[PDB]
Amino acid sequence: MTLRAAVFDLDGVLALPAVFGVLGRTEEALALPRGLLNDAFQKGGPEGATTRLMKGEITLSQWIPLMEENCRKCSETAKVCLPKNFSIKEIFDKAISARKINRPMLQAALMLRKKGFTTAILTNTWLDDRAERDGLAQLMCELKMHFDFLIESCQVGMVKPEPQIYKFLLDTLKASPSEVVFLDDIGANLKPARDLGMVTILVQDTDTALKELEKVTGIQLLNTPAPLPTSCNPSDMSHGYVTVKPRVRLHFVELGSGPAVCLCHGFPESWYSWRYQIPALAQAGYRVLAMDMKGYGESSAPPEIEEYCMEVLCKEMVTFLDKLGLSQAVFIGHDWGGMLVWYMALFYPERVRAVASLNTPFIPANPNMSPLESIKANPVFDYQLYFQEPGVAEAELEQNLSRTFKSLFRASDESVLSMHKVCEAGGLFVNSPEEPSLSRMVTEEEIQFYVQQFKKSGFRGPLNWYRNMERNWKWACKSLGRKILIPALMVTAEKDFVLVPQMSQHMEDWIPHLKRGHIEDCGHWTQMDKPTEVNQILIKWLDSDARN
């Protein structure tokens, strides 16, 4: 009785404008009799060319000549002449290409699945072997990924509105008719579903159909708050492993095609910290490589400290590119990752297409001051001195992993940590709760992912990033005569109280053509705090500075 599944037509529902709507305009534009194109499209009914195409018996390219002959046949009976320019191939290329995802509809399908619905796309479609077929493929992938099932007439050999396909749908959904709502823009397609007893919504305009669907499901789908960007399910990702030297292999996650964009997380994070950027960046036309940095996750975590100086970390990233066969990548870092990407740009500009850092400014080494002196001359960096002694901070951070990340991963108005009193107090969590509340930015499940990751190797490796102050300083001094002249983006976050925006104020002295982004009401954990804003800044910058 209570709905438990939602089925969406594609053309005219999830994807607008519908092909019929474009063809309708094509008829007018070309001064053809009203409906002639639709007549030709449907000639023969169940036994005609278009039903054979929709059942997969023939390909779209095979079907164009038949469509052409139907159009001639139709114009002849109508005592009209088709234009000299008449091309079914061009007409459908246009129509197919004009079709965009109906975002309010997709987001309602997503909301329904979030609340426990099985969702499916049921569409009459064709095997597309046009030279331009990649466009449609990209559209289906982007929709496909958000649904439990994609049922295509041409893969199952059945078409709407044949009753057999709705029985196939119901068996695929493992649900009974009255448990399913089906949305289609063609009433003929609803009749058989209605017969079986499933709820049907005839989609004329999206918002009316969404109101009907809100009513029958009891879920608010119209006027919902803005949803977060698509996240990553770890077990659905492609996982990559590259041995950069004996005993040291880098793990990374890969999604998308196009120019390589390597994401480098900070302390104490993971490739998963980019989970909101990976699908967006892949969707925007990039090949994203989200890495578990050295010391983290499934990446090797040797115990020696000097394995984590910036010079060794940067050479390994370079080896990573070599072994993957990438002459270049865009490097996008956050926190310690942002520091690493700056030095990638300073020491290996030929391998860096463009560099972006979130939060972490480029601070040139001061040759007249030991890095220890400078750290001591900033109370907010006091916690770093606490990280110096091997084993001390490891023991506090490894004691209760859930508490560690629940205490760390918090929005600016939820913090339970005072980074400036750490040494004095003898610890990072000294005056922090034993069972902190779950921040709004994270779910218990996301927390548990990080917990599982850091069970592999703990915090030794990740803390070792802090234990090469002098080594990094000596190496960084070698670059004091350089400038960064490749495309470069600095993104500041208003409420990062450690890496404050002001820290970046002098960066243009070393990066003259630096581009900037700013995110308001954003704490240190920028990617999960303001994912939608990050993705907009990053994607805009990529398209203007990293793509050709």
Added chain:
Amino acid sequence: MTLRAAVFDLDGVLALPAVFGVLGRTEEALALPRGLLNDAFQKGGPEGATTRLMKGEITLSQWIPLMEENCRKCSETAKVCLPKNFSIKEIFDKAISARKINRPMLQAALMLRKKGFTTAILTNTWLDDRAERDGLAQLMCELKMHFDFLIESCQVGMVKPEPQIYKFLLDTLKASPSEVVFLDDIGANLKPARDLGMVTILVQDTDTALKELEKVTGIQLLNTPAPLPTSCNPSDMSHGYVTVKPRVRLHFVELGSGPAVCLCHGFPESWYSWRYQIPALAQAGYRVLAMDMKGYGESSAPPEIEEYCMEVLCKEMVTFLDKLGLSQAVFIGHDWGGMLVWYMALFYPERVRAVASLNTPFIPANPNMSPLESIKANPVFDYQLYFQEPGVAEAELEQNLSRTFKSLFRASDESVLSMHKVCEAGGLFVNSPEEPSLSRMVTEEEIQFYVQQFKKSGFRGPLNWYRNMERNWKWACKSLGRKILIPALMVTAEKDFVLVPQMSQHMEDWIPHLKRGHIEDCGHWTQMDKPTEVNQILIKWLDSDARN
């Protein structure tokens, strides 16, 4: 005393023409005093702009203005006027871009390393932050991969001919001066090496220098037979894992950037069977995904037979693309892989940029004949009936893995197997040696790689590809009304006595625009038999039919 290391200069030795040679012509072309450009380039000596650039103190972009001022200063002392068009940036862009690998030199370095030499590149070079820097990066990667060490003045802060860099070289090589031969096109660079006592060759013309190097090493480097293409070292590859459904994950190897090219091996092979194509295809501008097919290697090998029908195999390849975020890939198959790629093109043309098969023709299902009847009506396919009974062929093939692959992987003039008497004789190796000789196509090490791979899961999974004759037939019949109209390449091999070229003779009936390649004196194992010819055919076809 006996040489054990070889050191190669880059500019003028491994890479031609040298930059000085282009600049020399630029001087003439622009009617400048002879040597003025070289004067400006060198002004200041150890303390001038170019030495700072070569030591990494500044970047190339920072160095252009200084070079410009040196050129003005030089033309002024020479009482000449630089042209109105004068641009150091353009002059060096041209020179850098004109530089190609000196293939006879690289191949001698490769031959030397094959015979046990430690090889290194020692070059004065710069940090390249030009907009065009990707060109140089690609050049270094392609050379880099063939050498034990790349020593760049700008990464080590030392330049030829300073004696310190040759002591750094010697320590990097772990060798003593008289054990090393050093080749450079600038005599000033040889003097310090000679001082230490290492053999030096002044490279004026490549062949003279190669004769000198043949003499001192005792190895023939000039007029050597054609070398095989670059192969793959498994532990140097990026390894990818994609879960396509519960219990089933696909393993693949990834190299290169550009359009995705998925390689699908046959029975009983491995991603490694493409080892000669992967680097070539990556080098040609493609992102290669060499897969361990379902049942093989590090890919899952469920025991049930129907997990290996073509329909399930093809859907999983599609899921593989979805989870990697590729709307399309080029599919290049061999043997059973070639059959799979044809059906990828028949059932998922929108996901297939282009399809190529080696050896395996597209044979449309005969709806009036059970596949068993047709197999029985060809003596050469008799071995397939032997593969039908679960466990029988597994036991013979798994008994001695070394013998299995030494018996299988053989050139046409080395065969020890009679595929037409298999059932009668009761086995594939019945009348074959217990310790077969090593074919010329493979090394003992390559054999052992396959041995290790098939220890993971044995032959059940791979043999199950043969055990869905009826299932595959019923599914293939659904496509009998289709044509393959995407870009398509059929490559035949003259001496494949199972998959004979004649088998493909009718393919144009179903693939009208089919392109063809033919390889003479080539047996069934086409990729390792004629790797150089495969790579030429494939790469030519890719550039004309899969790239935009």
